[PDB]
Design a protein around this motif. Structure first.
Motif, short mmCIF file in Angstrom:
data_model
loop_
_atom_site.label_atom_id
_atom_site.label_comp_id
_atom_site.label_asym_id
_atom_site.label_seq_id
_atom_site.Cartn_x
_atom_site.Cartn_y
_atom_site.Cartn_z
N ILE A 1 0.84 -1.20 0.00
CA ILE A 1 0.00 0.00 0.00
C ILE A 1 0.87 1.24 0.00
O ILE A 1 1.76 1.39 0.85
N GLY A 2 0.61 2.15 -0.95
CA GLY A 2 1.01 3.53 -0.83
C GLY A 2 2.51 3.77 -0.82
O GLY A 2 3.01 4.57 -0.03
N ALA A 3 3.21 3.15 -1.76
CA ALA A 3 4.67 3.17 -1.81
C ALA A 3 5.25 2.58 -0.53
O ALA A 3 5.91 3.26 0.27
N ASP A 4 4.95 1.30 -0.33
CA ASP A 4 5.51 0.51 0.76
C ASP A 4 7.03 0.51 0.70
O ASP A 4 7.62 0.21 -0.35
N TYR B 1 6.92 -3.53 8.65
CA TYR B 1 5.74 -2.82 9.15
C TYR B 1 4.93 -3.73 10.06
O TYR B 1 4.74 -4.92 9.77
N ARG C 1 13.01 9.04 -0.04
CA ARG C 1 12.89 9.39 1.38
C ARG C 1 14.19 9.96 1.92
O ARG C 1 15.24 9.33 1.79
NA NA Z 1 4.49 4.60 1.79
#
Ligand code: NA
Ligand code: NA
Ligand code: NA
Lengths: 368, 360
Positions: B76-79, B85, B340
């Motif tokens: 999900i969502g640029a894991d 996690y 990031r």
């Molecule tokens: Na992400």
């Protein structure tokens, strides 16, 4: 054709058909031969969502025979066909025309079996076995490692047979006591070095989605047919049709008893075996109507060779009830008025058939 | 009484909401190449697996447990491929203890969140604690308390509306860092759980279905919004990234990319800022990381080879470009990309250019 199947996937038609097959599976919960008490009914729809999750790992995520990997086809939150709470189950999709190496550490779990299977619940409603290996034939290397070859071609060493149609490896690790036993740590790979996987193919995904959806419908139908067939012997525990248990993926070392049970809050089911046969393992588990074990993370719903205390004369008594009577071996009904129940002898030359009777739970508490 | 559930109506509505989610894959602002299209439908099925653990199986705040909300086969969502996690549903009116072994992984963060994608399309943060402030016991164990009531020690704030705890373990080097081993329990423990409540399942199934629809819609909205700057990597709207469950130590860049077979995307940062961690990952259009089990689709602070001047170059291409740091397009003509900086006082903005792969 394959062209139509791929077109339907790319257009969204397959996704629609997938969801509609999922939807139609709700009829297996609503069947008039199934109990309709709210708990069973509610658990049935959760059960369908659980079959979904298993089906997608089975047929979409871990279905590449060039790149096998283990996943668990039954565990604490997804359950099929009287799942053994004392088991670590591991499943890998394989191609019976290829060869595989299963490696890793043996660990200390005492019972470990490897079955290869073909067909599938989504295809023929069966999981017919094509090969089998347990401790009787297993050779452990000196270093405590494990080396197992899956092949349709005979190999020396630890060879597990496959046929061209073989498509699954089902591993059972059966724990006497998970707190003190260490699981085997196993990996599966193709024997010949594989180039990187190809990108996701629309045709393969079309097939995986439909098989996943059909797995939910057929698996729920299959074991709902079983549970309803037990009604004539409710609250007894007769021996099962063993060949039938094997045909749906049972372990050939195991002798099964399956039944359904029905108890009011003030009633208890008293199960007795007069002797315990020589065996490698035995247990008994309490399930809901959908043949999911009850939630053994929070309820005592399974008793086995390690935890069942014998009676003085060597027999064993197990009591199904809402609360424990004294210090007897106990299966907690966990809010259920009805469900199914499974007893296993593992490696018993002569099975001993349990007898049952229904009594008032108060009679056992006063007496004990 | 859960009338809709007991009758089968909830199950039908659940499946029909799932079915309508296919429209998020078929959207005309999404690519229609067969790979992206096929991955889109698998993505929906992966979202449903996460959704059911979130809203059906592990949704009892009285009996919390961790599960993984993004891993090798559901994303999900640029894991972040370098993350382990963990997610647990909690109730902000109760108190929780998170215990276990700290391990040696340097980056470890705890966020408490409220709402949810299935509800408001958001995952607003209600509290935060990371490894720098944590106090570890002598035996290497760690104890952390989630509560709306202020506590001494390792306290993570909650609000009454808090409903989730999101743990990130971010690895510089999985070969030499050991993961934390954590479990969560409610502090004021009560009797054994009640049997399944039909009303709770009725709500959970519908939330699971709406999670699939809203999550795919959300990040497909994000991906389409990148079209004006395809093959660039501008800074993201940071508050927006935080509002969907980001980590507040992290400065994000999101974009989409599009490359012919003979083209490469060359990314450069002239310097590397002092930071605890940085990486860049290649995703498909659905903002799932590509399959890092078999392809080199992530480069991070530990594995990136720097240039002589201390800068770093990263090349997205179909084939290995020399010995440069490489993101493998893995059969994809188009996708998204995420960079990031974690814990950098001054972010440094990557630049990009599209070149012919022969030049490298
Ligand atoms: Na992400
Ligand atoms: Na079983
Ligand atoms: Na991970």
């Amino acid at each position: 054709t394959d062209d139509t199947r791929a077109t339907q996937l790319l257009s969204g038609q397959t996704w629609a058909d997938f969801c509609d097959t999922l939807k139609r599976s709700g009829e297996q919960i609503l069947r008039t031969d199934a109990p309709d008490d709210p708990l069973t009914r509610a658990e049935g729809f959760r059960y369908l969502s659980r079959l979904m999750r298993i089906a997608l790992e089975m047929h979409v995520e871990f279905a590449d025979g060039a790149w096998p990997g283990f996943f668990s086809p039954s565990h604490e939150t997804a359950k099929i066909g009287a799942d053994n709470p004392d088991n670590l189950y591991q499943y890998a999709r394989v191609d019976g025309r290829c060869e595989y190496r299963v490696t890793g550490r043996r660990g200390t779990v005492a019972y470990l079996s490897f079955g290869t299977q073909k067909g599938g619940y989504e295809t023929d409603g069966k999981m017919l076995q094509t090969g089998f290996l347990d401790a009787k034939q297993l050779e452990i290397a000196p270093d405590g490692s494990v080396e197992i070859v899956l092949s349709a071609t005979p190999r020396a060493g630890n060879w597990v047979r496959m046929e061209p149609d073989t498509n699954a490896l089902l591993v059972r690790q059966t724990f006497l006591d998970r707190r003190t036993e260490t699981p085997a740590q196993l990996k599966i790979e193709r024997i010949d070095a594989q180039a990187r996987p190809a990108p996701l193919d629309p045709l393969a995904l079309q097939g995986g989605l439909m098989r996943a959806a059909q797995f939910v419908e057929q698996t729920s139908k299959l074991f709902a047919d079983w549970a309803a067939s037990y009604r004539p012997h409710v609250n007894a525990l007769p021996p099962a049709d063993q060949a039938l248990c094997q045909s749906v993926g049972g372990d050939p070392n195991i002798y099964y008893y399956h039944s359904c049970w029905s108890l009011a809050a003030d009633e208890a089911l008293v199960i007795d075996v007069d002797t315990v046969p020589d065996c490698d393992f035995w247990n008994v588990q309490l399930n809901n109507y959908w043949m999911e074990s009850l939630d053994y993370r929070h309820f005592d719903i399974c008793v086995n060779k390690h935890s069942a205390r014998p009676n003085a004369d060597g027999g064993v008594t197990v009591i199904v009830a809402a609360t424990r009577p004294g210090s007897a071996n106990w299966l907690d009904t966990a809010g259920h008025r009805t469900g199914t129940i499974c007893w296993r002898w593992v490696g018993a030359a002569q099975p001993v058939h349990p007898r049952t009777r229904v009594v008032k739970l108060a009679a056992l508490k006063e007496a004990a």
